[PDB]
Amino acid sequence: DLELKKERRVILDCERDKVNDIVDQVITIGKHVKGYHYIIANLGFTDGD
Amino acid sequence: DLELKKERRVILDCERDKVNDIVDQVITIGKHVKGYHYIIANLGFTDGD
Ligand SMILES: *[C@@H]1O[C@H](CO)[C@@H](O[C@@H]2O[C@H](CO)[C@@H](O[C@@H]3O[C@H](CO)[C@@H](O)[C@H](O)[C@@H]3O)[C@H](O)[C@H]2NC(C)=O)[C@H](O)[C@H]1NC(C)=O
Numbered sequence A, B: 001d002l003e004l005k006k007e008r009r010v011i012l013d014c015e016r017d018k019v020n021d022i023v024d025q026v027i028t029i030g031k032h033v034k035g036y037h038y039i040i041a042n043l044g045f046t047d048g049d
């Protein structure tokens, strides 16, 4: 559903546990190539994998 | 070096152990989106992850 309007820029406002799962599922579906953008909306940017 | 001539189609002639490592490093560098091709050149196509 995020490919209906051809969305390129996503802000992830999740905690230290959900961000890793969302990044793992993005990597599984393959949406981390050059052309997109992500923001890890917390203070622990180095906490995730 | 495989992006010099803009290669799209890669045949992987490796055993059951090296194929998983190559697929993991492709997923790490992000070259498994729609547009590329792969051939797992062994009899154990369902053996890998
Ligand atoms: C950061 O993420 C965004 C979203 O994917 C992308 O931003 C684009 O980055 C390019 C650099 O590759 C920039 O283009 C520049 O545009 C300015 C306009 O003033 C121009 O003067 C420069 O010569 C250059 O062409 C731009 O900031 C930005 N937007 C567009 C439309 O290109 C990109 O993925 C990431 N950018 C960086 C720098 O990390």
Ligand SMILES: *[C@@H]1O[C@H](CO)[C@@H](O[C@@H]2O[C@H](CO)[C@@H](O[C@@H]3O[C@H](CO)[C@@H](O)[C@H](O)[C@@H]3O)[C@H](O)[C@H]2NC(C)=O)[C@H](O)[C@H]1NC(C)=O
Residues within 6 Å of the ligand: B008, B009, B035, B036, B037
């Ligand atoms: C992965 O994606 C699809 C599914 O296997 C493959 O797409 C098919 O590619 C062939 C070769 O380019 C297409 O044939 C072409 O048809 C056009 C239209 O007549 C013709 O002008 C070309 O000369 C060529 O014969 C075929 O149409 C296309 N299938 C569909 C449904 O569009 C693709 O090759 C696969 N492999 C990759 C990307 O390595």
